[PDB]
Amino acid sequence: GIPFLEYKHFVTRTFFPTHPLLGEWNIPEHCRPSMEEGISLFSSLLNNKHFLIVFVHALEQQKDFAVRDRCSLASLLTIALHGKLEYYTSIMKELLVDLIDASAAKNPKLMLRRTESVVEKMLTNWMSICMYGCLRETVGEPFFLLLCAIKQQINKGSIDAITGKARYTLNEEWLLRENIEAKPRNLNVSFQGCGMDSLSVRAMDTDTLTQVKEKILEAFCKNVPYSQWPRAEDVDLEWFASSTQSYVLRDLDDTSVVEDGRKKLNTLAHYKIPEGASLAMSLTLDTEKYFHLVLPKVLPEIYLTRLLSTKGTLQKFLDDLFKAILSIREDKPPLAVKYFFDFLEEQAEKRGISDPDTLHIWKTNSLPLRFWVNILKNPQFVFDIEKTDHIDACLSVIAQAFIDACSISTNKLLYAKEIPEYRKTVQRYYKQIQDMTPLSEQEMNAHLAEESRKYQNEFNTNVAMAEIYKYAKRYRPQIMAALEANPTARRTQLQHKFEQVVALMENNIYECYSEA
Amino acid sequence: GIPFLEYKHFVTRTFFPTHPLLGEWNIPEHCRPSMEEGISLFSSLLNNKHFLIVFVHALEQQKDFAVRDRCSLASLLTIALHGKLEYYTSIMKELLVDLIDASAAKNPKLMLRRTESVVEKMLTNWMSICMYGCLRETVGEPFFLLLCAIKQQINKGSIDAITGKARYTLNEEWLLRENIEAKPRNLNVSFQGCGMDSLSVRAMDTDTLTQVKEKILEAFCKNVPYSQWPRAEDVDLEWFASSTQSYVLRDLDDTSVVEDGRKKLNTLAHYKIPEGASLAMSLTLDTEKYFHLVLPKVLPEIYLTRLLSTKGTLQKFLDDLFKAILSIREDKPPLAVKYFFDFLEEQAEKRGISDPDTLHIWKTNSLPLRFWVNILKNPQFVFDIEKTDHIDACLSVIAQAFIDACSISTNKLLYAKEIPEYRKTVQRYYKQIQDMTPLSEQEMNAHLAEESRKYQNEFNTNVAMAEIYKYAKRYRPQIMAALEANPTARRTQLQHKFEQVVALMENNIYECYSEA
Amino acid sequence: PRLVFHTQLAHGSPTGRIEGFTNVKELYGKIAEAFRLPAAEVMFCTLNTHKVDMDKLLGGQIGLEDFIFAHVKGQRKEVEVFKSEEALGLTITDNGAGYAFIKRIKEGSVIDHIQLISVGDMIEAINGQSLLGCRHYEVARLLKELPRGRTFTLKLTEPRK
Amino acid sequence: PRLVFHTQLAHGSPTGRIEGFTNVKELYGKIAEAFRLPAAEVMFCTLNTHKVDMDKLLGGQIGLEDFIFAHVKGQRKEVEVFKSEEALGLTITDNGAGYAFIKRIKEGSVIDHIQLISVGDMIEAINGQSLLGCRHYEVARLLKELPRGRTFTLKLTEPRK
């Protein structure tokens, strides 16, 4: 029962830094018949390769067409054409060749290192689409179990509510460096008729009540997506101290202590909450002002020990994940990855680039770094789960280890002894792909056509096109200049069919002028 | 064949410092049905005395309702109600009483001295309407002959084209004080098939050719209104010096002389134009740069002589005019003047103001100074004639003499010996009016109704109302406050019928709000 | 849904009438029809000016660009107001159908302080005294008359949302 | 001349259709009719927003506020132009019916200097070569191709005035 996101939200969240692209269109009925035919005609243009390629090149020669914009067009395109992924891939390959031809002067090992062109973002989105199946069927579960394993592990120790520093972590910059006597507590909590009648929730002596409330919310909502949980500040917490009395417990009230100007957040220890205490849950910061646990060359052994102990706990979970990501399920091999890696090798040979290490870099820069590193750092892209600052800092260490495994060569000493074996795994992976029988254009296109067909009515392509047309407007004379320059565009009168759209979208034939 | 203006232009020119008020309405067909009923309803309101009186009082208590504005409302009103002069007079009398009651603290001799209230301008317009008949039937001809007599008289001597100073004038500040040898010339001028074949035009040696051109234009256009004349700069002038040659004559060309930095305007003398010279006329300034005749305690006798000689020439014409203005034609006496003067005496007695000199002042301040002085100074209000700076300066002297005759008590020494006899005439006039049998409200109202009826379709009352409504908008809450204050306005729900108009004119019922 | 447009020739003509048009070519044909001209004689069309103004060129559809939202009566409320100042701070118009409501509430005013009075609220009574038949200026009159230093009672109705 | 307006209840409803209205009271009656409500239930109407925005209150008639002036072909002209600069300085669109004309003439340009070329002038030929069938961008192409330093000839037509 892993809380996977449905494909349209996965796409939405990884394509953009997007409610409009999943619902209806916001064009008033005033100009609705007008823009209806406008977008229709513009879709025909976007699917005309002799247009779209010029259209992208032209836009990319304008200095005020920022990187932020280039990535927007790419994602807008991926959505606009998501029903025609065969065609979309055709365009991406063409634009990738153009990108390689442009970088024929530069060092080959620098290809696809960053995402600063339309095709590079396109490539990332392509990878997102093709790898989503891998997530759903293979990688998602070990990824998720790891996340759980991290959460459970960090919670076996104190965590500072303000700074996020915990006793246990993978990240040495997040070590709670106070030697805090943490006393575990088993609470007996009830909810307002929700779930089971009473649960045994484990908490620490040192937990603020927001922290205790979060732990109780986890205990009562295991089989539910996070987006449906009550927020910790949407629930109250009573303590049945006896049969005659009960008290509301808060992080801050008339009993909170002040030390050197700052107010100390209330903890279970503060209220002298006893072991076994029965609670009831119901529906209902300026660091210079407050504090929790942190009263304010070489790592002392116990801090190193704690980095090791949490490394140790997570290690099987972590291996399982890296194995899932860097291995071929013989059941169903990675067709799209084979297809693209072969395209890389193909383009490499056409230019006499045979250096095994350069090819390794191209593949690494195409899939593990494009896709997987951002997934590890952002599990909120894949699952309906809480994003917390600390767990992200742990995933940062892990993502770094992944990055290092795909490489060829202080804070990097923790996973240092596992990186060689990971490199072997990555290299073995790349080889395994190079060994599996190649797939024809026909087979790939059949697979792509299936992705298109599966997720037909997910995205509002009209809205996507409408956004693309805005760029098409802002550079209308440049686009026109670029179509006039291209022999094939003029021969087919694409200049007319372009302005035909501009006239319709603007409801004004006089939005089409020429200088002389 | 006096070139009188038609009544609607006379009205237009004296009511305002007004093409819109003689033609059609500029309200688009967009809001035409809307504003149609708006203005219709607003006319009903304006003709409701219990509204209009409050409406005027309310507007006159606002500090930012300037004098310029007050006079505009008055003239707009006179036009809006020109078909209902009985009612209009009724309103003016009511507002005049209010104006007298307000000035019950001040000195009685100060009434109607200036035009700084709505009723005072109304009064002037009233006088304009009622006196226009006098102009057409009695005063206009002697006034016009005088103007001709002045023009003819000044032209017997040199006139400087730049400064307007002439040899002959009534105004000592306009005396050409150069002793210029003026030689008269008889020219034989022809026009392009216009009028007679050749005319004998009289000009001076010293005339610039613009001046000569103007003299020829007068000679060819006697029986025609000035507004139809060719402008002097719209005609060329050739000189047949012989049968072999002719030359174009200009104020300025390649033969013009320069003296001490300035260019001297060409004159007949400059071209050595001989006596009897044949010319042909056809259709075609910075004082530091150019000059004409003026090369730059007690009046020397010859300048006094010239003031006397032109005074002398005009004297019979001038007496005739002043007699026409200050006398009762027994044929048809001045009904409107009798009617109003009696209203003055009536209001005077109601307040025990019996001082003969105070009453004299009230009458003087009501008709001779309100109307006649501005007519003398502005003959362009009455006739289709040219307005020249110098003749206006002569009429200034004459107007001053008129002003002095209506009074009771250096530059005023010219007509000094005629003023006593004029005073006798004025006093005799006032008495003659006080002696003629009084006319009933009935008779006056029948006379007014006839003026209304005669000039029915002259003025665009809709446009007039529309302008009035603008003021009605700008002070909508004040008007509303003033209607709420008045017992009779609230009792008749004038507040509703007002806002009913505002809603229609604005096409918005939500242009009607109230604060609380 | 039949649209009718008014029409003149830019150089002077009587006013012709034209039925709604889909594209610009159809417009010229219709204009030429109404003035008995070959349609190839029309050059271009302008809006609300006879002058050759290219900022007023007409190159698209014209039509009703207006969506009308109606607000129905919703929740009935009854609030107390203590008139501490001379000005309550509200503005009152009416819908031209007997109901007078709040068009504005001046910021910082007495009414602006009351959570349960919002804009677009119809006022039905003042101290149980109904306001039926009362124009917006008569309603505002009644409010200003109310004793300063005492509490009055409004019966209100919010539009449904 | 039948107007049709789109209609919703501000709190949510399907879209109803309403025929043109003379005053505001008739509007409410028509709205209530289309949604089967007593007409006394309507409080007020807003335009292009469901929100309670008093700046978008609808308190008057709505209708075609547009007067369409058509420009007919008038005087034919033939002018010479010496292309001394790279840019002639004119802008060319077309009426969507085969005629392409001058929409703009840049101030200070080569064309701006020529008295007998004004805005709204149709261009019919370039050196006697007709421009029938030529889109506005194809006409501007032909002009830029013309030899710089030589003189070309335009056949023009002014709209009648």
Author numbering:
A (entry chain A), B (entry chain A): 1345 to 1361, 1389 to 1655, 1668 to 1679, 1697 to 1809, 1819 to 1925
C (entry chain B), D (entry chain B): 56 to 216
Text taken from the publication that reported this structure:
GIPCs contribute to the endocytosis process by tethering the cargo proteins on endocytic vesicles to the motor protein myosin VI.
While full-length PlexinD1cyto failed to crystallize, we crystallized and determined the structures of a construct with the JM segment truncated (still referred to as PlexinD1cyto for simplicity), both in the apo-form (to 2.7 Å resolution) and in complex with GIPC1 (to 3.2 Å resolution). The structure of PlexinD1cyto in complex with GIPC1 is similar to apo-PlexinD1cyto, except in the C-terminal tail that binds GIPC1 (see details below). Binding of PlexinD1 to GIPC1 is expected to dislodge the GH2 domain from its autoinhibitory interaction with the PDZ domain, rendering the GH2 domain and the PDZ-GH2 linker conformationally flexible in relation to the GH1-PDZ module. The GH1 and PDZ domains of GIPC1 in the PlexinD1/GIPC1 complex are well structured and form the same domain-swapped dimer as apo-GIPC1. The two PlexinD1cyto molecules are placed at the opposite sides of the GIPC1 dimer and do not contact each other. In contrast, the tail segment in the PlexinD1cyto/GIPC1 complex adopts an ordered, extended conformation. As expected, the PBM interacts with the PDZ domain in GIPC1 in the typical PBM/PDZ-binding mode, where the PBM forms a short β-strand to pack in an anti-parallel fashion with strand β2 in the PDZ domain.
